[PDB]
Ligand binder design. Structure first.
Ligand SMILES: Nc1ncnc2c1ncn2[C@@H]1O[C@H](COP(=O)(O)OP(=O)(O)O)[C@@H](O)[C@H]1O
Ligand code: ALF
Ligand SMILES: [Mg+2]
Length: 53
């Protein structure tokens, strides 16, 4: 995970970042459709922080 976050991703989010990164580096787009309140707003920040770090 990007150390830039000053935060910890949960298990179900860290694998979710890997999905986000894999689609990005393979040049394709996707839907993060997780159930409400699971933290989709957080996984969103984590992929930007990866593109930064
Ligand atoms: N890894 C995490 N560490 C701390 N708080 C988290 C984490 N993931 C989610 N949250 C908390 O979950 C709450 C709701 O998540 P949010 O992403 O807004 O739901 P939604 O997926 O509807 O956007 C937020 O206040 C956020 O602080
Ligand atoms: F349940 Al949400 F943004 F997906 F509040
Ligand atoms: Mg949201």
């Amino acid at each position: 995970q990007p150390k830039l976050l000053n935060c910890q991703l949960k298990e179900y989010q860290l694998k979710g970042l890997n999905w986000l990164v894999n689609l990005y580096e393979q040049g394709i787009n996707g839907i993060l459709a997780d159930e409400m309140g699971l933290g989709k707003t957080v996984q969103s920040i984590s992929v930007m922080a990866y593109l930064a770090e």
